[PDB]
Design a protein around this ligand. Structure first.
Ligand SMILES: OC[C@H]1O[C@H](OC[C@H]2O[C@H](O[C@H]3[C@H](O)[C@@H](O)[C@@H](O[C@H]4[C@H](O)[C@@H](O)[C@@H](O)O[C@@H]4CO)O[C@@H]3CO)[C@H](O)[C@@H](O)[C@@H]2O)[C@H](O)[C@@H](O)[C@@H]1O
Ligand SMILES: *[C@@H]1O[C@H](CO)[C@@H](O)[C@H](O)[C@H]1NC(C)=O
Ligand SMILES: [Zn+2]
Ligand SMILES: [Zn+2]
Ligand SMILES: [Zn+2]
Ligand SMILES: [Zn+2]
Length: 233
């Protein structure tokens, strides 16, 4: 259980607006999340997430999210990106951030009067996959391989970030990455822990585009997706 925290995602805003009772619950399942991290169709979840608890589809704006950029950046800027993991749902695994560099695709996710179809959500997901922001694009960032992967498998890739080993004696799992205090970020179930990295934004301008967060489990078949509205100017 988790969701994107910085920049503030649609899911974070849905919870802060008093709409989403369990932001960390928005999940794509059942799916094959491992070891091939991008083969599973994203279905209704799409690149922004769907929360079944309250029937909230984050792929379209409402009065509470999606209307404008939450934060503005510069092309090529190295930025802080953070997600929030629940204390009781820390799965380990691998996660990433993506930006679709096709504005006309993204526009269909910026219209409060339009709900993307599942085919449009998948075409968008494919554009996000193409627009993955690699861990390794940030000078000096350590980009390791997963303790839950072996070379030759489709999870053996350090463009994606990895959580710490599930079985590590010190600082295991995703919480171990920052080793932050409980409730350093909000979750509804048991309180949240931050998971913080940097990415290099693309050399691309938009007054309003999306960054999509994706987190895949290894032990169970589950994917968590969120997106944030940003500007790159
Ligand atoms: O308004 C929110 C919040 O802002 C500040 O705190 C931010 C953040 O601080 C801490 O996260 C740390 C990580 O723990 C630490 O590991 C490090 O992550 C680095 C890595 O070291 C690098 O290798 C590379 O990948 O980049 C990441 C990200 O820079 O630094 C981050 C902070 O950037 C803390 O654990 C989190 O809980 C915090 O959100 C203010 O201090 C805070 O008061 C305020 O609440
Ligand atoms: C953003 O909008 C302003 C109009 O307010 C315009 O001048 C500028 O070119 C736009 N930027 C992009 C990246 O489209
Ligand atoms: Zn979970
Ligand atoms: Zn479940
Ligand atoms: Zn694949
Ligand atoms: Zn286009």
């Amino acid at each position: 259980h988790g969701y994107m925290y910085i920049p503030s995602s649609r899911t974070r805003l849905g919870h802060e607006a008093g709409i989403d009772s369990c932001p960390e619950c928005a999940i794509l399942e059942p799916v094959s999340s491992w070891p091939d991290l991008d083969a599973a169709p994203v279905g209704r979840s799409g690149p922004c997430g769907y929360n079944a608890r309250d029937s909230i589809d984050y792929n379209q704006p409402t009065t509470n999210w999606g209307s404008d950029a939450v934060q503005s950046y510069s092309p090529g800027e190295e930025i802080e990106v953070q997600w929030c993991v629940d204390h009781n749902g820390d799965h380990g695994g691998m996660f990433t951030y993506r930006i679709c560099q096709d504005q006309s695709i993204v526009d269909k996710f910026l219209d409060p009067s339009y709900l993307p179809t599942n085919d449009e959500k998948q075409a968008a997901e494919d554009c996000f996959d193409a627009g993955l922001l690699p861990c390794t694009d940030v000078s000096g960032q350590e980009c390791g391989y997963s303790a839950d992967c072996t070379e030759g498998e489709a999870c053996w890739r350090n463009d994606w970030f990895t959580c710490n080993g599930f079985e590590a004696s010190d600082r295991p799992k995703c919480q171990g990455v920052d080793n932050a205090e409980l409730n350093s970020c909000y979750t509804s179930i048991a309180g949240g822990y931050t998971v913080t990295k940097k990415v290099k934004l693309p050399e691309y301008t938009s007054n309003h585009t999306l960054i999509s967060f994706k987190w895949n489990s290894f032990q169970t078949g589950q994917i968590y997706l969120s997106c944030a509205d940003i500007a790159i100017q």
